[PDB]
Amino acid sequence: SEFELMKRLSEIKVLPILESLKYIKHNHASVVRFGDGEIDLMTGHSIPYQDYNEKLAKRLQQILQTKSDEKLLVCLPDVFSNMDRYNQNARHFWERHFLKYSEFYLNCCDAPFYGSTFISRPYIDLIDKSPSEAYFESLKELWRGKDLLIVEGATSRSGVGNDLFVAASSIKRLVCPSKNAFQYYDEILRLTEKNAKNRLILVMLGPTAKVLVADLTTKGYQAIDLGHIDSEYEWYEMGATYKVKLTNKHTAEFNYDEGIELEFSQEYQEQIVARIG
Ligand SMILES: O=c1ccn([C@@H]2O[C@H](COP(=O)(O)OP(=O)(O)O)[C@@H](O)[C@H]2O)c(=O)[nH]1
Numbered sequence: 534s535e536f537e538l539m540k541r542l543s544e545i546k547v548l549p550i551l552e553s554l555k556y557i558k559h560n561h562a563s564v565v566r567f568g569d570g571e572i573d574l575m576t577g578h579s580i581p582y583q584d585y586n587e588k589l590a591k592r593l594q595q596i597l598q599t600k601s602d603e604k605l606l607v608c609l610p611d612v613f614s615n616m617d618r619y620n621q622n623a624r625h626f627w628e629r630h631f632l633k634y635s636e637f638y639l640n641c642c643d644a645p646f647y648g649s650t651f652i653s654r655p656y657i658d659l660i661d662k663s664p665s666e667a668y669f670e671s672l673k674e675l676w677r678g679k680d681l682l683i684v685e686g687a688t689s690r691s692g693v694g695n696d697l698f699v700a701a702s703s704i705k706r707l708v709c710p711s712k713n714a715f716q717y718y719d720e721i722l723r724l725t726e727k728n729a730k731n732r733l734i735l736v737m738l739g740p741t742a743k744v745l746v747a748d749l750t751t752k753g754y755q756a757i758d759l760g761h762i763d764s765e766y767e768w769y770e771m772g773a774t775y776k777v778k779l780t781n782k783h784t785a786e787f788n789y790d791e792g793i794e795l796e797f798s799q800e801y802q803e804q805i806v807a808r809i810g
């Protein structure tokens with residue numbers, strides 16, 4: 534029975550958002566997050582913004598086997614216990630997901646603990662949004678007073694038009710393709726390294742982000758996979774109750790980057806070190 538698989542899967546232990554953040558800070562750890570799309574890719578499917586690629590799938594599988602330590606926190610969706618935190622559509626989505634991949638989760642995810650993939654998703658799927666302010670405040674402490682290198686796609690525009698990164702000392706951006714970034718992986722890694730001197734690296738780049746963080750970490754850098762944090766922050770700032778489309782940039786869960794009306798932001802443009810693609 535699926536019910537019995539649900540119970541068995543609750544053996545997986547995830548540190549929820551605030552606990553994950555305490556871990557990252559205490560340890561100055563890199564962070565890689567596995568979401569539903571990564572599992573889809575690893576098992577042979579194409580996902581929003583990234584076509585199936587066998588080399589990518591293999592790297593993702595290797596990275597998932599890495600133990601979490603003071604250098605790197607490996608994260609999973611925080612859905613194996615206390616699912617009642619999430620709204621009905623999210624609960625259904627996630628249970629369907631881990632039931633489909635029960636064999637994957639039961640067999641490949643045997644570490645003593647994982648961080649939360651939802652460090653990038655601190656608002657919209659929660660029934661009780663009261664803790665979200667605290668979540669975002671804790672997140673911001675990661676980059677307060679830091680020089681940042683943000684590696685993201687052309688539509689991501691993380692922090693653009695909002696105050697998410699206002700307390701960062703400086704921002705440089707490596708702007709990559711908004712879809713199929715893995716095709717340019719070697720160049721992305723090469724230019725990230727070149728520009729990372731004395732910077733904290735934040736990556737918003739789908740499955741490619743996980744490989745980048747893994748490789749940067751092996752080279753001794755702290756790099757944090759932050760995914761869709763910008764969409765969540767925008768929804769939080771407007772007090773959104775549902776996933777509303779942003780007009781000026783990519784929006785999480787809108788899976789084709791359609792209908793985007795781009796603006797010219799001099800400040801954003803001046804932050805761009807190079808474009809890849
Ligand atoms: O080839 C790609 C794949 C995705 N992204 C960006 O990656 C971010 C989302 O990353 P992820 O899937 O890790 O987000 P999560 O939902 O797990 O927070 C968004 O800004 C996308 O625009 C990108 O720019 N290029």
Ligand SMILES: [Mn+2]
Nearest residue numbers: 568569570761
């Ligand atoms: Mn996602």
